[PDB]
């Protein structure tokens, strides 16, 4: 197999668990990718566009998958439920709402797999439409071996549904939507943000 | 901020 | 079971084929695409059978990602631009100038290119167009289930259709499929160069005030 | 002097408007905002001899600034709230909920509370709010200078009025001139407050698309 | 000008004598330096807390370079003249998406800026003005820099009875432009900050500053 | 709001 979903699984076993977050994000993203099969055979300029323009989806989907076992709310990788009213009142609830009825309860609603989901991660990760690879072509078929396997788990593993490989590719279109809209609402706040913005440019 | 407060 | 046969959603992508005859200019474009729009809607198969509150939800839900897939798919047939429902095919250059060279690119790389480069068709045109457009995460829907079932009737048979017509390739479905995130992502940037369009220039509020009836400092 | 455009003029145009989920009820009160704004526009001295067409310019223009000039003068009674048109009564905490929070906060620090302390008044409030509705640089007028002039005039009359009730405060009339700053900077604020909801907007956005 | 005389304003204003957006990016840390001299010589400022001045610092960031430049342009005629000696041009600029924020300024700051002879006393005295704001987030002593205030613009009401008595409007004409100066400098803001969400992966500035070479680690 | 569309339908 080139592309094996028992190594994908390793990955996302290997990485089980206001955010001063991320140096542990950062750690955790890198780690699992690593991991995946093909991914540092790849120019190391290509990963590093790779892990970050994907960075916020991958996060994304993994806060879904943690929190499905949670009730009406999201579990951060901090270990932290999260609940609407926490987070209505504190200005996300367009998100959290969209990130569990889009997100986490069709998540639930198949039984999403560890392998499953980390298949769908690598997906998402080997993004060809990323500006700037080096070339673009190479990471394509990657992802293109990627869900070759994936196609075939389903079937072994799932041969009732057979509508499943497609029920799994078709949660990506929401998982990138919420991540823009995160980026919205990130961008907004520092916007609206107290004191002066723009601080932000780093010179 | 620090860069800033060089006066 | 070929329910929901790519014959007749074949059908649908022609019947709206378009009579040989800025923002702005595609201001124009998607109302009178109304027209398309719905036309386009009411022959996919089981579509108009949705209680028509949801059936509505669709529609406008569905809409600008259905509009965009329609310009991406024709454009493969040109080099270098888009070519609108308006006729007018654009250029970079403009398209640049009048502000939406941001938007613009991401639709000739991510989106025609793309296209083209798997040399779709129209069958599997509008295939990816009813997918989108059978929306359950939409938002008001009495039979969200409803939705979702019917939905992946459309892909099961687009399944299908592909291993006919392409059998040396048995990853073009899934290629197809992937699209869709980009054609999703694709559509929200373009509300965010709307709504910054309107902000960014003067008496924004006009919109949003509802309808201008100022005139009345008669009574 | 005054006789171009007289205060105790101005001051009668307030006197005639005053009322006889704050995003929620904001909203729902805008046909009665539409009387208000033209209504005390009206009574403004000049305002009717101008081109039928600047008129709408200028109030459309303005819409937003005059209002939130109006409903945070009327909160001065009220302590740490914000009193709308309706009446309502608005509080950090329920408008923090509502995501306004931003916003809110501006006003009272910014905007109600330096009113209060400053002891602002009907004709002072008055005379800055015909100052940003003559308001000059507003596109497409057809005579920029008609309106040049009249705001001129205002602030003449302002500032005369001040020296007149405040010999004591050389500093009022300049003062107020300083708030429009501020009622400016609130205004697009609240402009990307009702953008962004309306974008991260649930349900069906581009709704607004309507022909 | 008992407290805040105008003449050392003059002498702080004088002592600082392709696509135009990298234009200012690529620009502007020159004029941090500017910004801070021109700070340091108004003759109060020095004199507050260390955490009150900085605040006003990133706070009037954004519409003293703006006023300056909107000042400058005066000497041309239908263009913006740069610190970086660079002149854009409205056909220029209107391609790297603002040519709505050009225009602004050149009709709502510039024009109006030179209808009027505004000169470099009067542009300083804005400055400080702008400079010494109360507003502004977290200030220990707020009313102290509020006070500072008062004493600039008086100055600047002094002045202008002085060169310019026949106009006796012309001081809160001046006021006046701080409005289209403020609403300006948002506008700004909102075309860096879409630009930054619409052309690119753009977390990174919001994630901090890029490592991941030692993503290998 | 918008029944423009429930009308072609
Ligand atoms: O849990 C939420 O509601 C939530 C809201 C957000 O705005 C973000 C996140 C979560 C992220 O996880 C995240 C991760 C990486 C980069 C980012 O910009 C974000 C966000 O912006
Ligand atoms: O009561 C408040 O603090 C308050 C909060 C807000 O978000 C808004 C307002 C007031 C407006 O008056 C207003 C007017 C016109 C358009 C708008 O979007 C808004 C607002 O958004």
Not at chain 1, 127 to 140: F, H, I, M, R
Not at chain 1, 146 to 169: I, N, T
């Amino acid at each position: 197999e080139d592309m094996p979903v028992e190594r994908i699984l390793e990955a996302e076993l290997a990485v089980e668990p206001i955010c001063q977050a991320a140096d542990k994000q950062l750690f955790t993203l890198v780690e699992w990718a690593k991991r995946i099969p093909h991914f540092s055979e790849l120019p190391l300029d290509d990963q590093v566009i790779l892990l970050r323009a994907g960075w916020n989806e991958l996060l994304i989907a993994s806060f879904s998958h943690r929190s499905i076992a949670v009730k009406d709310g999201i579990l951060l990788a901090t270990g932290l439920h999260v609940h609407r009213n926490s987070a209505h009142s504190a200005g996300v609830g367009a998100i959290f709402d969209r990130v569990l009825t889009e997100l986490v309860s069709k998540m639930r609603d198949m039984q999403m797999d560890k392998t499953e989901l980390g298949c769908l991660r690598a997906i998402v990760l080997f993004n060809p439409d990323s500006k700037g690879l080096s070339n673009p072509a190479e990471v394509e078929a990657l992802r293109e071996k990627v869900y070759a396997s994936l196609e075939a788990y389903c079937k072994h593993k799932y041969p009732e549904q057979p509508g499943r490989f497609a029920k799994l590719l078709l949660r990506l279109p929401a998982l990138r939507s919420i991540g823009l809209k995160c980026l919205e609402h990130l961008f907004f706040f520092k916007l609206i943000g107290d004191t002066p913005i723009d601080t932000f440019l780093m010179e | 901020n620090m860069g800033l407060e060089a006066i």
